[PDB]
Amino acid sequence: VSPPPPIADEPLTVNTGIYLIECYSLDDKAETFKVNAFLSLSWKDRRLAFDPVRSGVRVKTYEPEAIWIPEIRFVNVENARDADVVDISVSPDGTVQYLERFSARVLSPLDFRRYPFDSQTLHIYLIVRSVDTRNIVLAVDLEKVGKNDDVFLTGWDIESFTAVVKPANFALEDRLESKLDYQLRISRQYFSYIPNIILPMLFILFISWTAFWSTSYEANVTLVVSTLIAHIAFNILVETNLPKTPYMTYTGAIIFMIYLFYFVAVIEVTVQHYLKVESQPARAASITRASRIAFPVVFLLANIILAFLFF
Amino acid sequence: VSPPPPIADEPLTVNTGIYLIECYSLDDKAETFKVNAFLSLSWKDRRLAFDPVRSGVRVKTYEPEAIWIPEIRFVNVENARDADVVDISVSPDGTVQYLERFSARVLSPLDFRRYPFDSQTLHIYLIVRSVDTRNIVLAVDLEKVGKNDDVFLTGWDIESFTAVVKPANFALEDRLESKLDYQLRISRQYFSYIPNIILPMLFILFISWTAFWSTSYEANVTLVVSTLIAHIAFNILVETNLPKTPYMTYTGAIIFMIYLFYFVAVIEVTVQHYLKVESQPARAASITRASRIAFPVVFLLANIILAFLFF
Amino acid sequence: VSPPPPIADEPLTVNTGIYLIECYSLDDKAETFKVNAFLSLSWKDRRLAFDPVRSGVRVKTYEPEAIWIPEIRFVNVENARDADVVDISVSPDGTVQYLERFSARVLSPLDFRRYPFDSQTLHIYLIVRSVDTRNIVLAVDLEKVGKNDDVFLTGWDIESFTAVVKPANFALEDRLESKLDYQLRISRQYFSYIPNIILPMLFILFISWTAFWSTSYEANVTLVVSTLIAHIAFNILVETNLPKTPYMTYTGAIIFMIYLFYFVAVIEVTVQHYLKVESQPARAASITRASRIAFPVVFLLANIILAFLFF
Amino acid sequence: VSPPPPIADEPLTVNTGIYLIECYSLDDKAETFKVNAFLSLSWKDRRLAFDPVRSGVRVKTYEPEAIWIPEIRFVNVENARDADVVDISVSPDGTVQYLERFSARVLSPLDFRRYPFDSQTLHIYLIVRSVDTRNIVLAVDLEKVGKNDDVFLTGWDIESFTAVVKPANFALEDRLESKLDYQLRISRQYFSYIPNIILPMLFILFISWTAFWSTSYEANVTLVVSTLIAHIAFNILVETNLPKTPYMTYTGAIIFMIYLFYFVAVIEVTVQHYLKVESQPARAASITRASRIAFPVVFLLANIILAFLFF
Amino acid sequence: VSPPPPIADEPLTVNTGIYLIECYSLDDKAETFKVNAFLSLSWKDRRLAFDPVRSGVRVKTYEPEAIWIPEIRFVNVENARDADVVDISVSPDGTVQYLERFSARVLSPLDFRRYPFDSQTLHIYLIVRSVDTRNIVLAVDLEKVGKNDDVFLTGWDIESFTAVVKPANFALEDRLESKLDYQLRISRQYFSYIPNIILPMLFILFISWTAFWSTSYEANVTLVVSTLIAHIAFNILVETNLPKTPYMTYTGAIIFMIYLFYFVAVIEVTVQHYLKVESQPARAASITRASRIAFPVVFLLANIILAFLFF
């Protein structure tokens, strides 16, 4: 019921820990992710200390209403964290060990520039409100911070679950207090995105490049334009995988460059035809012969420039 | 338990403030957006005033049930806001400082005409119901209205968070009262919409225009019609980004104009062929040669007209 | 707590009113729509009447549990409405003024035959269960039925919000009682549907009709078949706007007719080619020349027939 | 309160009835359907019998808590039904008449083989748990089973609402008891599925068959392959209507056969070309001339065979 | 009330059982599934034992509050299950028989590698928290574990509902306890996936292979490229069925191989044309003639390699 009284001006330290059981629903559209984990809280309350002789046992189990529990909340969540309390154990010195199982949709922005090689830092912000009697400060108990052997992260590599040990206070409210940040560093796995996205998109463009080894303007127009259609269609096919970003992404820049190369390939084919029809087939043949190397070289070069710009 | 009594006929002033922590799920289809913010309320209640010497402390903390709190509600929300109280502090003169954290889906119409340069005014309407003893009026505390330094609005520029200082009363109910409006002026960022939507859609049309530099009717039909298909496919590709509006938008007018240009390009190619087959190749060559300039010129001109009409 | 006793056998009249604040989620698939509105109830209870001098105030505010409130329910809703009470005010004569804010998904069938010119009648059925002590009858207070100046209905014209003043009793239950119907007559806005749906779909078909002014079978096959593809693609593009109806709609009949015209156009092109190859170019030329008028004429005629059949 | 005592060993008979008011959300994907209906329960309790002379009235109205009500539940629901009680009336002999309004998602498998002519049997399984004091058995009161005149079933014909009078006991639990089944036999309406799905899909294939009346290999390749594309596109267009079934459906078999016919048509066109180029234009002409009849004939036969196999 | 006291140090055994009534919402995207089942709990409480002679009846029915009930929770659920209790019966020896109906979204990872032949193990983890007075251990009662005769799993074969008899303790919390696992082994049905996905996808590729029996470079380019488009379109058509996996799946590898074969087929056609134009038609004819066998052989071989690698 009542908060524990402070022996001195020192604030009450609440040790926190999150044991990630499962992470489901990775909505790349809303930049939200659902989490199911264990939340552990540890704090010393002299009020519940006892002697083990007269009490008999070494541990005392209470119900959430029977004792005082700090109001711990999550900052970046869609709605209040659904709470299922598991156990409350008090040690002889009065140290309370709280454990609850929770599940909540977390708001965590994602940077899609480096996609599909991008690395992300998922954040889970813990916060506590200090009362008039008593101030409450949060701490991280590394022994209660962990991820299970059955942690499944399909498509990502879990780099580090290391929570922010020094989490700066958010000056939003009138009274500033330290909000314990939980940084989960992950890196995207890409073994599929090449054979499923990049490679076939390169194949269609290379097919368009066969117009440099032909003289029939009709066949060349069919090649370039029909391949352009195939490219659009393929983009429609993979649209789900690609991200709808208001900023420029690496992938998006490659796509744009491919569109430019289709335009230039059209220009080339048209010029070659015009020169042949205007009775100068020597120039037409020279341009086409040059394009056979120029296009792949310029493409590979611009890809190195792009890669350099983004990485 | 009871409303504060007025010393004179003057109404009770409730100072309001909203500190926007995070804005997620910006559904352009339903024209709704989810918000997570702090709501602060400030009002003077003489009933809770005290002397700080005999009471000892300078501030007095109460629970929501213990004291009277004005019934503040949001007008344009899908459903009732999340009700999580953070703190209630009473100063020696009796001034109550209320703070709560809420999360709610806000209903706010969006004008998509100027898209993708469109600017929007997001509205958050605050309202209070006046009691029999004393009427209650709302006010804006500019010191408690703010956005954090890390608030990032992906895809938008935040122009002004300036809430309506003079919010007209909504004559909806039987008793009219001032409803405090919160205008958030934002402007769309477009650094991506050109390379991802406009530019490739211009490329496909320009490809269709190469039929003016060819004489093979077969190749020209393939160029124009196949490019038309590529255009439809590309629209399907970007369909998600484009808005389903029941009124005419700037983008939609450009799209329609592109469809018209494909039709006219077909007409040209057909006429050229007919004149050649109908033994007048001088006219055919003159029309095609003219079209080489006419089409781009007329396009850029009509585009300037469109821009002028919408801006 | 207890129902007001009737002074005579007359039933208790509950005056109702619905103030539609916002209407979101217009599901064309389920024929359901979500509504957010104010519900006002007014009825006279002598038990709560008082004198304003000895009582001091002119209005008396109660809590929902403190007094009797009629059990008002909605018939055509997915589930029970959102129950958020706003205010309860009692006038000196005992007249109770109840106000609540609700949000619920309403079930209302939609007729898509006349689409996209279709007019609809949205229904909201109010119902009350009469108790043994005194029967309760519903009435409409036209002064409390209204829509705000900020009422947004994007794409529709609100014809009449006139609720059914004489709503017949539904003989479903064992005891029949009058259920207050709320008819919202609306008519679809089409300022976009011509330039966004009809016109480009007509353009593609007309492009297919250019095969009648050409003799090259290859170019004609490309024109007709490729335009047919463009037609399918365009339908996919506009798919969201068109309705998935199990009955035949006007738009759907037009679409089917367009498919038929593509088939016939194929037949024509094939016949013309066969006659030319089978050494009778006079007949081929006569058929093609006739088709140049026959196709548009028959189309416009059948279009007039369709319009007549549906309107 | 307590259950009514049996005069003899006979079980308590609870007469049931369901009045289907509206049926919304027909998810053919999840094979679930939402229902909103009235549930009526009737049973004789001597404990509540009275004389109408000393009591004055002929009917006695109670509240659900005041008297005993059997625990009736639904078997095939996603989650527990909506519980809104309408009326409880007791006759002088003690016969209780219970009426409640409910809304619940019913889980009911659908057989899509005969689609789009398929007939379905929707099931609603009622169940009651027998207590130690007296066993409870369910019965069907045909007078309380009905569907309103405003029952709307868009796209289906309601064959019979006849609930299972002899519903076999589910040996699921340890104690087997009869579970009252409610069979709703419906048949699909198809006046739209032919002009919207079948007919245009036949048109595209017939267009592919025009390659048998031409000798230009280029035009034939364009015809067959481009029509194949048009076929895929049309399937994408109607994809929503067609079902994603893990077993073989009639429609799915037709679709597969059409794909085979496109493959064979390709073979024919290629062979014809090869024979002509390999200086045997005689074989090519005989095969093509035969195919002109063979393809439609074989198609119609295989179509009758399919119909016979499925019906 | 209070937990039952142990006669000796042995822990309290709670026998569990889950009777799966219905399984809806099989989200292959989120790898979650919704379940509706009965949960039965059985445990002996000496405190409630009675003699059936003095009490009269053989069974005693209690309310959940009246007696002690173990706190059973699910590990891998989105949120706490729906809690609707059905019955609580106590036998004369004191053995309590608890039955509740629940509905909850279960988190279960799915392995899509072997798709569409893949087999899955759905997991439902039961857990109980031991109190200070007496430790509680869970057990599985197979007589209360079952699935109804009307259990519907459209598209899957239910192999075994056998729960983990020896479920290892999860060392997540501070105090390790055995968590009863419920393994539901299922295998995917594929009688449709061949005629609906594989077969037509093979048909289009085989159509591309007809370019090896033709010499017209124009027709071959049309064949290969247009079939490539048809392939992309078909993937778009079936996109819903295929899984968006971040790892390499068997199906995904087949798809990639098909894309490679389209690229190689393009190369072949181009080489053949180049050799013919460069005045060496003997080599061109030899390559084409070889490809006619090489392509199917290499395809079938690599397909056998893939099957072997995944199975």
Short mmCIF file of C-alpha atoms in Angstrom, two decimals, chain D residues 88-290:
data_model
loop_
_atom_site.label_atom_id
_atom_site.label_comp_id
_atom_site.label_asym_id
_atom_site.label_seq_id
_atom_site.Cartn_x
_atom_site.Cartn_y
_atom_site.Cartn_z
CA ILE D 88 -37.71 -13.33 -19.21
CA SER D 89 -41.41 -14.15 -18.71
CA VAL D 90 -42.94 -16.80 -16.41
CA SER D 91 -46.43 -18.18 -17.05
CA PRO D 92 -48.78 -19.23 -14.21
CA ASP D 93 -47.88 -22.92 -14.56
CA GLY D 94 -44.21 -21.95 -14.13
CA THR D 95 -43.15 -22.14 -17.80
CA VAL D 96 -40.18 -19.80 -18.33
CA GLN D 97 -39.78 -17.96 -21.67
CA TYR D 98 -36.23 -16.60 -22.14
CA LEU D 99 -35.15 -14.33 -25.01
CA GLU D 100 -31.66 -12.93 -25.69
CA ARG D 101 -29.98 -11.22 -28.65
CA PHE D 102 -26.52 -12.47 -29.65
CA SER D 103 -23.83 -11.90 -32.28
CA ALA D 104 -21.01 -14.36 -32.84
CA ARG D 105 -18.59 -15.57 -35.49
CA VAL D 106 -19.47 -19.16 -36.38
CA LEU D 107 -16.82 -21.54 -37.67
CA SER D 108 -18.28 -23.58 -40.57
CA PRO D 109 -16.31 -25.47 -43.28
CA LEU D 110 -17.22 -24.87 -46.93
CA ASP D 111 -16.86 -27.36 -49.82
CA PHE D 112 -15.73 -25.43 -52.92
CA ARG D 113 -15.61 -28.36 -55.38
CA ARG D 114 -18.96 -27.67 -57.10
CA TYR D 115 -18.20 -23.87 -57.23
CA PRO D 116 -19.73 -21.68 -58.66
CA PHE D 117 -22.81 -23.86 -58.42
CA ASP D 118 -21.78 -25.22 -55.01
CA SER D 119 -24.35 -25.73 -52.28
CA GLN D 120 -23.47 -25.42 -48.60
CA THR D 121 -24.81 -26.57 -45.24
CA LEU D 122 -24.05 -23.98 -42.57
CA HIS D 123 -24.00 -25.44 -39.05
CA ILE D 124 -24.75 -23.83 -35.69
CA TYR D 125 -24.22 -26.32 -32.84
CA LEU D 126 -26.07 -25.69 -29.56
CA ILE D 127 -24.93 -27.47 -26.38
CA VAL D 128 -25.97 -27.72 -22.72
CA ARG D 129 -24.03 -29.19 -19.78
CA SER D 130 -26.00 -31.58 -17.54
CA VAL D 131 -25.66 -31.06 -13.78
CA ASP D 132 -25.39 -33.69 -11.02
CA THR D 133 -28.90 -33.00 -9.70
CA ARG D 134 -30.75 -33.35 -13.01
CA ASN D 135 -29.65 -34.04 -16.57
CA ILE D 136 -30.61 -31.42 -19.18
CA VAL D 137 -31.65 -32.27 -22.75
CA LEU D 138 -32.23 -29.82 -25.62
CA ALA D 139 -35.20 -29.70 -27.98
CA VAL D 140 -36.21 -27.64 -31.02
CA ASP D 141 -39.35 -25.48 -30.93
CA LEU D 142 -40.14 -25.04 -34.63
CA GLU D 143 -42.47 -22.13 -33.83
CA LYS D 144 -39.53 -20.10 -32.46
CA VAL D 145 -37.17 -20.98 -35.34
CA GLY D 146 -37.47 -18.48 -38.16
CA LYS D 147 -35.96 -15.87 -40.43
CA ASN D 148 -37.44 -12.42 -41.00
CA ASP D 149 -38.97 -11.09 -44.21
CA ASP D 150 -36.05 -8.62 -44.35
CA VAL D 151 -33.47 -11.43 -44.28
CA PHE D 152 -30.92 -10.47 -46.93
CA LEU D 153 -28.65 -13.12 -48.45
CA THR D 154 -27.00 -11.41 -51.45
CA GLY D 155 -25.75 -14.05 -53.90
CA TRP D 156 -27.26 -17.14 -52.30
CA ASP D 157 -30.58 -18.95 -52.25
CA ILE D 158 -31.71 -20.09 -48.80
CA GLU D 159 -32.91 -23.65 -49.30
CA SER D 160 -33.86 -24.82 -45.81
CA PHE D 161 -33.41 -23.49 -42.26
CA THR D 162 -34.57 -26.87 -40.85
CA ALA D 163 -32.46 -27.59 -37.76
CA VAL D 164 -31.45 -31.18 -36.98
CA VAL D 165 -34.36 -32.67 -35.01
CA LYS D 166 -32.20 -35.72 -34.12
CA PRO D 167 -28.74 -34.25 -33.37
CA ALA D 168 -26.29 -37.00 -32.41
CA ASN D 169 -24.32 -36.71 -29.18
CA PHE D 170 -20.67 -35.63 -29.44
CA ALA D 171 -18.56 -38.27 -27.65
CA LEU D 172 -16.02 -35.49 -27.05
CA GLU D 173 -16.47 -35.04 -23.30
CA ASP D 174 -16.34 -37.74 -20.64
CA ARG D 175 -20.15 -37.55 -20.39
CA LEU D 176 -21.85 -37.63 -23.80
CA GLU D 177 -24.89 -35.40 -24.35
CA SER D 178 -27.00 -34.43 -27.36
CA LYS D 179 -25.85 -31.20 -29.05
CA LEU D 180 -28.66 -29.50 -31.03
CA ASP D 181 -27.44 -28.86 -34.60
CA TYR D 182 -28.86 -26.03 -36.76
CA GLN D 183 -28.51 -26.86 -40.48
CA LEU D 184 -28.91 -23.89 -42.88
CA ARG D 185 -28.93 -25.23 -46.47
CA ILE D 186 -28.02 -22.58 -49.09
CA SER D 187 -27.25 -22.63 -52.84
CA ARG D 188 -25.00 -20.20 -54.75
CA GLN D 189 -26.39 -17.72 -57.29
CA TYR D 190 -24.51 -17.60 -60.59
CA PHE D 191 -26.31 -15.14 -62.92
CA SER D 192 -23.16 -12.96 -62.71
CA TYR D 193 -20.34 -15.54 -62.61
CA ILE D 194 -20.79 -16.49 -66.29
CA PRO D 195 -20.60 -12.97 -67.87
CA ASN D 196 -17.97 -11.84 -65.35
CA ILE D 197 -15.68 -14.90 -65.15
CA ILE D 198 -16.41 -17.76 -67.58
CA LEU D 199 -17.39 -15.94 -70.81
CA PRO D 200 -14.39 -13.52 -71.05
CA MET D 201 -12.03 -16.37 -70.15
CA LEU D 202 -13.51 -18.33 -73.04
CA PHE D 203 -13.19 -15.29 -75.31
CA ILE D 204 -9.42 -14.99 -74.72
CA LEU D 205 -8.86 -18.69 -75.48
CA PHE D 206 -10.98 -18.48 -78.64
CA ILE D 207 -8.86 -15.51 -79.71
CA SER D 208 -5.82 -17.75 -79.30
CA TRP D 209 -7.53 -20.25 -81.63
CA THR D 210 -7.42 -17.75 -84.52
CA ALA D 211 -3.77 -18.80 -85.08
CA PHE D 212 -5.20 -21.80 -86.98
CA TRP D 213 -6.54 -19.55 -89.75
CA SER D 214 -3.23 -17.72 -90.32
CA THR D 215 0.15 -18.66 -91.79
CA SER D 216 2.30 -15.80 -90.43
CA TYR D 217 4.30 -17.44 -87.63
CA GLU D 218 5.05 -14.01 -86.11
CA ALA D 219 1.36 -13.09 -85.87
CA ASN D 220 0.56 -16.56 -84.53
CA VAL D 221 3.22 -16.34 -81.79
CA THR D 222 1.87 -12.91 -80.85
CA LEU D 223 -1.71 -14.26 -80.77
CA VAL D 224 -1.02 -17.35 -78.63
CA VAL D 225 1.54 -15.90 -76.21
CA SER D 226 -0.14 -12.50 -75.82
CA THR D 227 -3.48 -14.23 -75.21
CA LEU D 228 -1.76 -16.43 -72.62
CA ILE D 229 -0.62 -13.25 -70.86
CA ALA D 230 -4.15 -11.83 -71.10
CA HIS D 231 -5.36 -15.07 -69.49
CA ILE D 232 -2.93 -14.75 -66.55
CA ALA D 233 -3.89 -11.08 -66.12
CA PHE D 234 -7.60 -11.98 -66.13
CA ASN D 235 -6.96 -14.62 -63.47
CA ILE D 236 -5.24 -11.95 -61.36
CA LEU D 237 -8.26 -9.68 -61.94
CA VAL D 238 -10.78 -12.30 -60.75
CA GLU D 239 -8.39 -13.93 -58.21
CA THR D 240 -10.51 -12.58 -55.34
CA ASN D 241 -13.59 -14.50 -56.52
CA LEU D 242 -11.71 -17.76 -57.07
CA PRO D 243 -10.92 -19.84 -53.95
CA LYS D 244 -7.48 -20.84 -52.67
CA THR D 245 -8.26 -24.50 -52.18
CA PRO D 246 -5.75 -27.23 -51.25
CA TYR D 247 -7.85 -29.83 -53.13
CA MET D 248 -8.92 -29.94 -56.77
CA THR D 249 -12.01 -27.89 -57.62
CA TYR D 250 -14.09 -27.98 -60.80
CA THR D 251 -13.16 -24.39 -61.73
CA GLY D 252 -9.50 -25.09 -60.96
CA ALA D 253 -9.57 -28.09 -63.28
CA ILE D 254 -11.07 -25.96 -66.05
CA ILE D 255 -8.34 -23.33 -65.51
CA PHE D 256 -5.62 -25.99 -65.69
CA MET D 257 -7.12 -27.39 -68.90
CA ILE D 258 -7.08 -23.89 -70.43
CA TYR D 259 -3.38 -23.66 -69.57
CA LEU D 260 -2.81 -27.00 -71.29
CA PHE D 261 -4.71 -25.81 -74.38
CA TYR D 262 -2.45 -22.76 -74.57
CA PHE D 263 0.58 -25.08 -74.44
CA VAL D 264 -0.80 -27.37 -77.16
CA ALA D 265 -1.78 -24.36 -79.29
CA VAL D 266 1.85 -23.23 -79.04
CA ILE D 267 3.02 -26.70 -80.11
CA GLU D 268 0.69 -26.62 -83.13
CA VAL D 269 1.82 -23.15 -84.29
CA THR D 270 5.48 -24.18 -83.91
CA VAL D 271 5.04 -27.50 -85.75
CA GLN D 272 3.16 -25.80 -88.60
CA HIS D 273 6.03 -23.32 -88.95
CA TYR D 274 8.69 -26.06 -88.81
CA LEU D 275 6.93 -28.15 -91.48
CA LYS D 276 6.58 -25.13 -93.78
CA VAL D 277 10.26 -24.15 -93.31
CA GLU D 278 11.38 -27.80 -93.72
CA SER D 279 9.77 -27.88 -97.20
CA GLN D 280 6.59 -29.82 -96.36
CA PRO D 281 3.92 -27.10 -96.31
CA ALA D 282 1.43 -29.87 -96.97
CA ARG D 283 1.70 -31.40 -93.52
CA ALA D 284 1.49 -27.96 -91.91
CA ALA D 285 -1.68 -27.12 -93.86
CA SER D 286 -3.34 -30.44 -92.96
CA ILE D 287 -2.55 -30.13 -89.24
CA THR D 288 -3.69 -26.49 -89.05
CA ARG D 289 -6.90 -27.31 -90.93
CA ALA D 290 -7.57 -30.21 -88.55
#
